[PDB]
Design an enzyme around this catalytic site. Sequence first.
Site, short mmCIF file in Angstrom:
data_model
loop_
_atom_site.label_atom_id
_atom_site.label_comp_id
_atom_site.label_asym_id
_atom_site.label_seq_id
_atom_site.Cartn_x
_atom_site.Cartn_y
_atom_site.Cartn_z
N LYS A 51 1.11 -1.21 0.29
CA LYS A 51 -0.02 -0.19 0.08
C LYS A 51 0.89 0.91 -0.42
O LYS A 51 0.66 2.16 -0.46
CB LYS A 51 -0.98 0.54 1.51
CG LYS A 51 -1.86 -1.27 1.18
CD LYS A 51 -3.00 -1.10 2.49
CE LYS A 51 -2.19 -1.06 3.64
NZ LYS A 51 -1.72 -2.31 3.81
N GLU A 66 1.24 4.72 11.83
CA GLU A 66 1.61 3.43 10.47
C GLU A 66 3.50 4.86 11.62
O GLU A 66 3.48 5.02 12.53
CB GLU A 66 1.52 4.71 9.36
CG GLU A 66 0.21 3.62 8.45
CD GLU A 66 0.66 2.35 8.65
OE1 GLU A 66 1.42 1.84 8.55
OE2 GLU A 66 -0.48 2.09 9.24
N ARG A 67 3.87 4.13 10.58
CA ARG A 67 5.43 3.71 11.33
C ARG A 67 6.06 5.04 11.15
O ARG A 67 6.01 6.18 10.29
CB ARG A 67 6.58 2.70 10.02
CG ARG A 67 5.79 1.13 10.39
CD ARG A 67 6.54 0.52 9.45
NE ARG A 67 5.84 -0.93 9.28
CZ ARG A 67 5.04 -1.71 8.47
NH1 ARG A 67 4.34 -0.21 8.01
NH2 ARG A 67 4.80 -2.85 8.82
N1 LIG Z 1 6.46 -2.61 -6.87
C1 LIG Z 1 7.28 -3.14 -5.53
N2 LIG Z 1 8.25 -4.03 -6.16
C2 LIG Z 1 8.78 -4.20 -5.28
N3 LIG Z 1 9.27 -4.90 -4.46
C3 LIG Z 1 7.85 -4.26 -3.60
C4 LIG Z 1 7.54 -3.65 -4.62
N4 LIG Z 1 5.43 -3.13 -3.65
C5 LIG Z 1 6.27 -3.61 -2.60
N5 LIG Z 1 7.28 -4.50 -2.29
C6 LIG Z 1 7.46 -5.31 -1.15
O1 LIG Z 1 6.74 -5.14 -0.55
C7 LIG Z 1 7.31 -4.64 1.00
C8 LIG Z 1 5.85 -3.32 1.88
O2 LIG Z 1 5.36 -3.02 1.09
P1 LIG Z 1 5.13 -1.09 1.43
O3 LIG Z 1 5.73 -1.16 2.71
O4 LIG Z 1 4.40 -0.99 0.16
O5 LIG Z 1 3.54 -2.48 2.12
P2 LIG Z 1 2.02 -1.85 2.60
O6 LIG Z 1 1.07 -3.07 2.01
O7 LIG Z 1 1.83 -1.21 2.84
O8 LIG Z 1 2.70 -2.79 4.57
P3 LIG Z 1 2.04 -1.84 6.06
O9 LIG Z 1 0.49 -2.66 6.39
O10 LIG Z 1 3.05 -3.48 7.31
O11 LIG Z 1 2.56 -0.55 5.98
C9 LIG Z 1 8.60 -3.50 0.55
O12 LIG Z 1 9.43 -3.28 1.36
C10 LIG Z 1 9.02 -4.46 -0.88
O13 LIG Z 1 9.40 -5.79 -0.01
MG LIG Z 2 2.14 0.53 4.48
#
Ligand SMILES: Nc1ncnc2c1ncn2[C@@H]1O[C@H](COP(=O)(O)OP(=O)(O)OP(=O)(O)O)[C@@H](O)[C@H]1O
Ligand SMILES: [Mg+2]
Lengths: 83, 115, 458, 173
Positions: free
Chosen positions: C154, C180-181
């Site tokens: 996300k 968030e973080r």
């Molecule tokens: N476009 C991308 N290309 C490569 N790796 C990706 C990509 N998007 C996400 N990732 C991988 O997923 C990990 C987590 O991404 P992100 O922090 O955006 O997740 P999130 O769903 O927003 O998580 P949270 O709920 O923990 O805040 C990244 O650190 C990376 O390893």
């Molecule tokens: Mg995130």
Amino acid sequence: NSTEISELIKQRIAQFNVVSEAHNEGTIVSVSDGVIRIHGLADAMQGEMISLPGNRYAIALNLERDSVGAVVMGPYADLAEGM
Amino acid sequence: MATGKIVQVIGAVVDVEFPQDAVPRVYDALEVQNGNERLVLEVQQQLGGGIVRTIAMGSSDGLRRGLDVKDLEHPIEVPVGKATLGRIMNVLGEPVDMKGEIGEEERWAIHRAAP
Amino acid sequence: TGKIVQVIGAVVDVEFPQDAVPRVYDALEVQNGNERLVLEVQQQLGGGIVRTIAMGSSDGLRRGLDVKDLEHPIEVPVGKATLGRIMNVLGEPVDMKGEIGEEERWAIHRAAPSYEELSNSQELLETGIKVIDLMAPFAKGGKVGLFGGAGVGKTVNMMELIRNIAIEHSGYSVFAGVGERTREGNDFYHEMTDSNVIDKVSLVYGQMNEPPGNRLRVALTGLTMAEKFRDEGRDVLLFVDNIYRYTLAGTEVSALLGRMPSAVGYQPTLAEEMGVLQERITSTKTGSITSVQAVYVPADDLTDPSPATTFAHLDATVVLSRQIASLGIYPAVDPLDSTSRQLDPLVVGQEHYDTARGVQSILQRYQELKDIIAILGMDELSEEDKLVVARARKIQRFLSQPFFVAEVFTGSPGKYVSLKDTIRGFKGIMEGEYDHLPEQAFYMVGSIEEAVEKAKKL
Amino acid sequence: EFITVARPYAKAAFDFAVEHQSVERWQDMLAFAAEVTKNEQMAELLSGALAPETLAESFIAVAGEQLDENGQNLIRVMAENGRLNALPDVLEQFIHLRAVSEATAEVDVISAAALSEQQLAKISAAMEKRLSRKVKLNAKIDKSVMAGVIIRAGDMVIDGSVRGRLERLADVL
Ligand SMILES: Nc1ncnc2c1ncn2[C@@H]1O[C@H](COP(=O)(O)OP(=O)(O)OP(=O)(O)O)[C@@H](O)[C@H]1O
Ligand SMILES: [Mg+2]
């Protein structure tokens, strides 16, 4: 006749020695599964360490209107009402 | 001398009221005369006002409100050692075989802290 | 004037003289040791008792403390004085710079604009991401929601949207960090300062370390700033770091407020609490807010009440799937669940609409075949079903794309793709123009030319 | 608030006081039992975990005036159920029951001026016609009343004020 009876009450409480706990001190009201209910402790604060008899503590989690809810940092089975 | 009285009986749960100054501690063992046999009660919770709540170690039928209650000041205590070998006992450490009394040397409380 | 009479977690009850009882959402103030604590009034109980939520740590509070009644709600600085600065839920500066040169302060509790004021718009807003503006394109002044579980991308997707939109867009922007973080807030702050784009962005941060009241109110603080910029007549971008934390902070306090649990233990007021927040994020005849929101999905359960309630409030919804993410296809968008109000032949035109529906149909048919394939294997399929599978797999690979913020993760340069290239590429794949290339040719290539160049070296 | 748990005791006390023709004494007795309840140290004791009978005997010790075996036994009953803090609400419902039984109503009259006292004769006659009760007036002068007068009896109100008439016409938008 209201002020008179008010001071009559204050005289008669002393005649019968009914009096409050000191601040920073209280009594255990009830004990169950490590949760402790304490009456008194008018100066206790949220998250304080309350020293129990023996050499152990309870952590104040709730300051209710009439009591303090606390959890015992150790064995609780030896605690009793009125400590 | 018995010092408490039964105040509620709801299935196996028995509530007993003591003087303010002598509430039994949690895990202590009480006993009452259920007619012509003794019934042991184990303390679970100390409620406010000298009332204590217990689980009956036996059949609850026949209990009245107002029965006298004796406060044994230790927890449930059971015989231990060589005399127990080859014997069948119930939870209270009483012989369930017909083979007479157990020649106990000690009785230990069943509630203990781990090493 | 007031006296504290109970302290239960984040909730504090205060007694006042019955002629002076504070109004709802009034701010109260109490000295807690060597610091000042604000309390916000939630409920009036009987007899001059009032129930409040602490905007800070409630530990160390005694009963019997004297409480001061401030005559107004929580009010925060608004306007250009906030630009380029980091602020707290209470509107205090949190960066080490001096005081905020406010000229005006606004109460964070406000009414939504009236039905008469709302404005329609169909201006398609382009993004650099193939799957998003193919499957779920969105307009200027609309709402976008990124739905996903833990760790599926996300934040990375939102950062790409920031990079592309909020830098080809010229107006002001507001970023609201909600539960968030903190590390991610600091990283964002710096890379804004290194790029010298910080002076266009107001940042409000209510991250997870904060006690529940802060996480509850910080979203309203951010909306209040965005509303100030909208009512000035500008076109504004609002980014919300995780809207779910607002509902969760409602859940944490609801039981202490004495309200019976509902559903999965949520507060009974969940829909109203979400709606009053969401209805204020709206473009208006005077000015336009474009919004991108991350929406955490607990236990990946899209049928949970919080995601389910959030779905109705958004114009474009992009659903991120853990099952796709574990294949390593990024961005992990599910095109059979992602959808937009803007995927309509009148606004997009016929070629885009037909391409999107063709992709959707082929992927749906692939879902229908996978249960046969799992038991029997592919060899039993018909020769047209094998072609459907062979094209669906290439479509799934071609939805992948390298991101600039994913340059650090992948190690390969990011790509920006024009919409025309996306439509042309997927139309070519579905027509079979590329039936002779291997699947690996399509993975993580920006455009179809790059697919053929990758195919030459396999 | 204690009203709902106080009602049964108020009825029982009034009924008993009717049988033994002691209503006035009972009122003066409940006043004292309510007043001791308000004292600081006694209030702390009431919030404590004393067993009912010990609390009852300490309270009865302080409540010396109480008629033994009637009011003191009422204290014992309320101590079994821990309703002693409701005593200010066990009183005033006793007074309400008395006023109903005596077919008497306190009625209130609020005006921009001290009323002419001939007006009060007419108002009292009118209230003794509206309600079939003897009506005690304790009228008041109030700045908020621009002109005219408000008549309040129980929970019924007859607004004759200029303020209310204005804010009633201003409603007609
Ligand atoms: N476009 C991308 N290309 C490569 N790796 C990706 C990509 N998007 C996400 N990732 C991988 O997923 C990990 C987590 O991404 P992100 O922090 O955006 O997740 P999130 O769903 O927003 O998580 P949270 O709920 O923990 O805040 C990244 O650190 C990376 O390893
Ligand atoms: Mg995130």
